[PDB]
Structure 1
Amino acid sequence: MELYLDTSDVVAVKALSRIFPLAGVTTNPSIIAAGKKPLDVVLPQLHEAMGGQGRLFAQVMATTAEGMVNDALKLRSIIADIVVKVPVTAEGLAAIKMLKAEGIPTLGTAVYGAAQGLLSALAGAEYVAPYVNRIDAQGGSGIQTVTDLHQLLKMHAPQAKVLAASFKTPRQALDCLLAGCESITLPLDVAQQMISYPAVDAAVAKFEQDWQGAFGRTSI
C-alpha cells in the first residue's frame, strides 16, 4: 500500500512526516496555484521536507503530445525520478505511449471512466488516478467506478496500480481501500479526521484516570 499527500505546504508536510509512514507526495497545478509558489522551488523544498525520500508527482499543462513530452523533459531535468502525470485525452494517450517508449514512469489523471483508465493503463501508465469526489458529485458512483477499474486492472494488466485521490470524507478513503486500491492520497483535513476520535480521547482519559486513582501517579 502506498500513502501520499495531495498538498504543497512545506511546513505541514514536514510536520506530518513524523506521523504517517509517507511514501511521497503528489501535487497538481491547482494545489501549486493555491500555494502561489513556483514549482522549481516547491518540489525541492517539499523533497527536503519529506527527508529526501519517497516519490514525487507533477502535472503538465500542454495540449499537444510533443508539448507534454517537452514538459516531462523539464520535470525530469528538475527532479530525476519524478513521475509525470498527464490528463487523459487522445493527446494524453499519445504522450503516454511515447513516454513509455522513453521509459519515464507516467500516471493517468482526470479519469472519469473505467474504460478511460483501462485504456490509459494499456497505453502504459503505471498509475491511474480517478477523481472520486468529482465523479461522485457529478451524479456518478466513484466507489463502484473504482471497483470496476480495479477489477479491470487486476484481470488484464497486473502491473498497473490504482491511485485514488480527490477525497472529502474519511468514508470515501475507507471504501477506496476496501475496493483493493494499492495506493491512495489524501488532503490535510481528511488526514486530520483520520487520526482524531472523541471516543479514543475519552477512552485514553478514563484509562489514565483509573491508573491515577489506583497508583497515585500518571507515569509508568
Structure 2
Amino acid sequence: MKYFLDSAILEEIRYAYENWAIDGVTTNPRHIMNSGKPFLTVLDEFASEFKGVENFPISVEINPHLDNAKDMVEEGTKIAKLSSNFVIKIPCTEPGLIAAKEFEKQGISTNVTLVFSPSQALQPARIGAKFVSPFVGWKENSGDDTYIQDIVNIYKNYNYNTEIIVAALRNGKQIVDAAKAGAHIVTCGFDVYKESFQHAFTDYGLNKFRNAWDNT
C-alpha cells in the first residue's frame, strides 16, 4: 500500500518522506495555488528535492484549459523533461484520454485524474495509463456513495497494470475503505494522515500505563 501526500508544500513533503515513508506526491492546480509559489517554482523545488530519489512519483497536472489532445501532449512533454520523477496528470476528457494514449506510447508516465465512474476508469486502463485517480470526497459532498471496489475488481479480473490512486480522501476511515477494497495507492493531505495514526483509546491506555509505571 502506497501513501501519496496530496500536497504541494515542501516542508510537509519532506516531513512525510522522512517520518511516514510516503511513496509519492500528487498535486493539482488548487494545491499549487495554495502553495503561494509560482507553478514553475514549485516544480523546480520538487525536481531538486528528489533529484536522485528513484520510485518517487510526483504527479503534476498540465494546463486545465488545454482542450486538444495535441496541446496537452506538447505541454505535458515540456513538464516531463524537467524531472524523471514527474508523472503528467491529465483529466478524464476525450482530448485527455487521446493525449494519455499518445503520452504512454512515447514512454511518458500519465495519471488520468478526475475519474468518477468505473466506465471513465476502464479506458485509461485500456490505453496503458501508469495511474488512474478515482475521486471519492467530491461525490460524497453531494450526497453520493463512492464504484471504487468495482474498479479494483475490474482492474484485477483483466490483469491491468494501471495502479489505482483513490483521491479526495478526507479521513482515515476512507483510507481503511480504499485498503479494504485493494486500491494500490491512497493520496491524502498531511493532516488526514496524522489523525489516521491517532486514536483516543491510545491516549486512554497511555494514561493507564503511565500510572502503573509511576506506581512501580
TM-score (norm 2): 0.91
Local SS of the residue matching 1:167: coil
CA contact (8 A) 2:136 2:168 kept: yes
CA deviations 1:14-51 (Å, max 9, x no partner) are 22333211112111111101112122221343455568
Structure 1 residues 67-78: aligned runs within 5 Å: 67-78=71-82
Residue matched to 2:212: 210
For residue 36 of structure 2, what is the aligned residue in structure 1?
36
User: Partner of 2:19: helix, strand, or coil?
Assistant: coil
- Aligned partner of 1:195 among 188, 192, 197: 197
2:96 equivalent among 80, 92, 99: 92
CA distance in 2, matches of 1:17, 1:101: 31
Give SS of 1:72's match. Answer: helix
Q: Which segment is superposed worse, 13-22 or 117-126? A: 13-22
Q: List per-residue Cα deviations over 1:110-150 (Å, max 9, x = no partner).
A: 001111111111122121101101122334321xx101111
Asked if structure 1 preserves the Cα contact closer than 8 Å seen for 2:61 and 2:90, the reply is yes
* Aligned counterpart, 1:218: none
Q: What is the root-mean-square deviation of aligned Cα atoms in Å?
A: 1.8
| Percent identical residues | 26
1:20 — aligned with what? 20
Unaligned stretches of 5+ in structure 2? none
Would the alpha carbon gap of residues 49 and 191 (structure 1) be closer, same or farther in structure 2, given more than 3 Å must change? farther
Q: Which residue in 1 is equivalent to 2:69?
A: 65
TM-score, length of structure 1 as denominator length: 0.89
Taking the aligned partners of 1:64 and 1:10, their CA distance within structure 2 comes to 32
**Would the aligned equivalents of 1:161 and 1:182 in 2 still touch at CA under 8 Å?**
yes
Larger Rg: 1
CA distance in 1, matches of 2:90, 2:80: 14
Aligned runs of 1:98-109 on 2, under 5 Å? 98-109=102-113
Residue 184 of structure 1 aligns with which residue? 186
- Residue 174 of structure 2, aligned match among 163, 172, 182: 172
In 1, distance between residues paired with 2:44 and 2:207?
41
The one-letter code matched in structure 2 to 1:98 is E
Deviations for 1:82-127, whole angstroms, at most 9, x for unmatched residues?
1111001110111011111101111110001111111111122121
Q: In structure 2, how many angstroms separate the alpha carbons of the residues matched to 1:203 and 1:45? A: 42
Which 5+ residue runs of structure 1 have no aligned equivalent? 215-220
